[PDB]
């Protein structure tokens, strides 16, 4: 056995990988493996890459996570305990593991989700 969790980011996270770089290794290895790219341009977003039918699709995930509190009412004191919010493409979730787990067995666009793509660029 070996590592392989959904909550562990160090398990389904590698780093920044361009389109050619991400695909170079994510060239549809297993029946269907997904990989998380380390976005850059974005001020604080995450890019998700999915492999299927020998392809590689990229999806940008938004993470509102508003640090500063903002009351919905015109007159009211700002709270302290506020949960984070994460949205991907045209769907919303609780966190990275929330969508990854809910889609770990369900289709996100035109395919399901399976174990993460090898951490290395070589099949061992």
Distance CA 79, CA 76 (A): 9
* CATH number, domain 14-117, options 3.30.505.10, 1.10.1370.40, 3.30.110.30, 3.30.200.20: 3.30.505.10
Picking from 80, 84, 48, the residue whose alpha carbon sits closest to that of residue 63 is 84
Distance of CA 19 to the CA centre of its chain: 16
Structure solved via = NMR
Cβ 120 vs Cβ 26: under 8 Å: no
The sign one gets for the Cα dihedral 41, 47, 51, 53 is: negative
Q: Is the dihedral of CA 52, 56, 57, 61 positive or negative?
A: positive
> Whole-angstrom Cα distance, residue 37 to residue 34?
10
3-class DSSP state of 96: helix
Helix and strand counts by DSSP (H, E) for the chain: 2, 5
* Strand intervals (E) in the chain: 34-37, 46-52, 55-62, 86-88, 91-93
Gap between the Cα atoms of 11 and 105, Å rounded: 17
């Amino acid at each position: 056995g070996a590592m392989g969790d959904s909550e562990e980011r160090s398990s389904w996270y590698w780093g920044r990988l361009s389109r050619q770089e991400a695909v170079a290794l994510l060239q549809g290895q297993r029946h269907g493996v997904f990989l998380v790219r380390d976005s850059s341009t974005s001020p604080g977003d995450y890019v998700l890459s999915v492999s299927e039918n020998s392809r590689v699709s990229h999806y940008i995930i938004n993470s509102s996570g508003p640090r500063p509190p903002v009351p919905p009412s015109p007159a009211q004191p700002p709270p302290g305990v506020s949960p984070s919010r994460l949205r991907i493409g045209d769907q919303e979730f609780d966190s990275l593991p929330a969508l990854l787990e809910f889609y770990k067995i369900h289709y996100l666009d035109t395919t399901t989700l399976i174990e993460p793509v090898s951490r290395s660029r070589q099949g061992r």
